[PDB]
Paper text:
Here, we engineer the hydrophobic QVVAG hinge loop from the domain-swapping cystatin, stefin B, individually into the β-turn-β motifs of the single chain variant of the sweet protein monellin (MNEI). In domain swapping, two protein molecules exchange “domains” or structural units connected by a hinge loop, such that intermolecular interactions replace the intramolecular interactions at the dimer interface of each monomer. We show that introducing the QVVAG motif into three different surface loops of MNEI results in domain-swapped dimerization, generating topologically-distinct domain-swapped dimers of MNEI. We then show that engineering the QVVAG stretch simultaneously into two different loops of MNEI creates two swappable domains in it, resulting in the formation of a double domain-swapped dimer.
A mutant variant of MNEI (L1MN) having a shorter loop1 carrying the stefin B QVVAG motif in loop1 was designed, expressed and purified. The crystal structure revealed that L1MN forms a symmetrical domain-swapped dimer. The two “subunits” of the dimer exchange “sub-domains” β1-α1-loopA-β2 and β3-loop2-β4-loop3-β5. Individually, both the subunits retain the fold of monellin, and superimpose with wt MNEI with a root mean square deviation (rmsd) of 1.2 Å. However, the conformation of loop1 is different in L1MN and wt MNEI. In contrast to the β-hairpin conformation observed in MNEI, loop1 exists as an extended β-strand in L1MN. Several van der Waals and hydrophobic contacts are formed between the QVVAG segments of the two polypeptide chains in the crossover region. Moreover, symmetrical hydrogen bonds between the two QVVAG segments result in the formation of a new anti-parallel β-sheet between the two polypeptide chains, which further stabilizes the hinge region. Thus, a significant secondary interface is present in the L1MN swapped dimer. For example, L1MN has a wider angle (~160°) between its two subunits as compared to stefin B (~42°).
Author numbering:
A (entry chain A): 2 to 91
B (entry chain B): 3 to 91
Write the structure that this text describes.
């Protein structure tokens, strides 16, 4: 899935020291002294959209070509990947 | 993951764009756009944006629930949420 349980080893314990240090910046509680991080530790790998790839059958100078073009997500920046032909119609 | 889209203006526009970019590299001479025909396929590309971490941390003998985010590209980290005290898991 998207969720995964991790070891409470060092990297994790160091995630703990960060939490408290940032908590101390806020100070909602006392001057929190870091003790330890315990099981369970949940890690959510966040997947988002980078943009797309379009596959075309396009007729150029009456010749059937297959165009592979990409487009970026937030910028709509498009780039032509491949362009071969002529190719058999589908 | 794979998607089929119609061949409307948007898609024809994609075709006008493609040819025009081929004219630049000109591996097939000067080509003139006619039309884009079925089928049109669209693939969505997903990349990792970063991570969220759910921790159970002890602070001054108090058990808290902390949520941190960490950013893929930059390793940048932020404390989303810090509540407590909370009963042991």
């Amino acid at each position: 899935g998207e969720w995964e349980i991790i070891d409470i080893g060092p990297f994790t314990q160091n995630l703990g020291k960060f939490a408290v240090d940032e908590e101390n910046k806020i100070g909602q509680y006392g001057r929190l002294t870091f003790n330890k991080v315990i099981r369970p530790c949940m890690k959510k790998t966040i997947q988002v959209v980078a943009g797309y790839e379009y596959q075309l059958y396009v007729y150029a100078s009456d010749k059937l070509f297959r165009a592979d073009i990409s487009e970026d997500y937030k910028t709509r920046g498009r780039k032509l990947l491949r362009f071969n032909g002529p190719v058999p119609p589908p």
